Amino acid sequence: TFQVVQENADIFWKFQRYNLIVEYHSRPALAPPFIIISHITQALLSFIKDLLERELPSGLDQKLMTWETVQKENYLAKLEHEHRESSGERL
């Protein structure tokens, strides 16, 4: 079971690590039992009033979309070229 599972376990660990880091993003920086100070501060701020999942300006967003399209075209061209130069296709 170890031999068969370890490789999938590593990928599952990375996938879970994403969610754990996302959770740690919004977690207050004060560990319990101190955390009550941060909770009171958050409640007071909510009553009175992210590095991940950011929103970009229109120009930069369009630039990144065009860059993604160019990279996709390059990737597809590379796949097609590797298909043409394959031994079976040449045969």
Add this chain to the structure above:
Amino acid sequence: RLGDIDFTGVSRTRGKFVRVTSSTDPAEIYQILTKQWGLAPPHLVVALMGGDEVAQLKPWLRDTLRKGLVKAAQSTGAWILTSGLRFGITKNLGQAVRDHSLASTSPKVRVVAIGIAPWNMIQNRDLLLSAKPDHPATYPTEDLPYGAVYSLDCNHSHFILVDEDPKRPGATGEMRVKMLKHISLQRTGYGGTGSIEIPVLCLLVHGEPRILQKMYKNIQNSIPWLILAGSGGVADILVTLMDRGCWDADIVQELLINTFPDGLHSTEITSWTKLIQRILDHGHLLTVHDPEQDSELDTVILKALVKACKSQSQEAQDFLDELKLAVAWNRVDIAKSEIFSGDVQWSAQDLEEVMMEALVNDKPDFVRLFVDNG
């Protein structure tokens, strides 16, 4: 008459322009391009001489041509001289140029699409007539039909708006020819130490018989021409004549009649026949690009340039610019097959500068070739 344009629409972009008359010296416009607008002297100039006809290229051939041109140009800093009007092959070529510019992670090498457009073809010219230096003129982008008036393409970075000459209705063509000739006599670098003569090259895409005089004038100015195999207009005539091997007056007249049934004028037909015969008389300045067969525009460009240079002379120093351009494109096979084939003697002093260029730019194949060649 200097101003800036702030295109408004799907994509907001800023573009420069300058109004100019057909009697001006092209040296002034080249100087303003190099200095006022900060454009570095190009390492390659590709001028489009078609695509304004009603019939347009198929999307597959259009995409193949734009991809080939952009891929060839992106190695160095190249200029693409087109009529800066949002229509036909020019619109999509400018779109591809801007797409490459946005996705270019290296801004040191820049592909610039210069627009030489007649002032009579501009839609909403009064909108840009303001051209306040402090506040750039606002211009709306509209995809007009064929008609006779077009809108300035937003994807073209710089524009050359030429006024129509009262003498003849060919001011824009004369300006294009003069500008190509003037650019062909410059140096690609800032200083004339490690700089080549700027390679000016023309591309023909479904030409009309009206542009035959301008094409022959360009050929007289000794600048190579590239002909698309499947363009459709005069380009088809030229590729068929190349496939024939020889040209006859009856043959060229028959092909011109078949390809352009609408134009039936005895004087015009005779003039076009003579122009085509004189164009084919050169030949070495003509080269056919078949995207269905080759699809490697850089290779064909290099072959045309080296063919023109070889026809010009046999001296090693003359071949130097073509060899340097081949170095800049990693075309070691083409260089070995054409430049370093028996005819041209090569001394170490001649090859020292090209060795420096190949060594600095990380071209191991050319380093091996030069070490093996003296």
Add this chain to the structure above:
Amino acid sequence: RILDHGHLLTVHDPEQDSELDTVILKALVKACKSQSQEAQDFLDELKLAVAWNRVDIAKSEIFSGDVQWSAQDLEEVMMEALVNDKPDFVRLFVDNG
């Protein structure tokens, strides 16, 4: 007199070709091409080629230089290729205007 026509005659060699659909499509497109050059005339042969996934035959015969193709002409055939799950013909029509 039969051989005088010729374009309506086509040879099927099962030892060589053994692809009857391809030969049928070739004969029909040959007859249509001999009949006329208009795009609307080629429409039925193009639709039949769509129905048989003969993208190679269509590209080699119908979409080869001679016949002009407008978007309005190709809209119905685009619909037919898109509904019937013919990705090759979708690619061909998108690439052809």
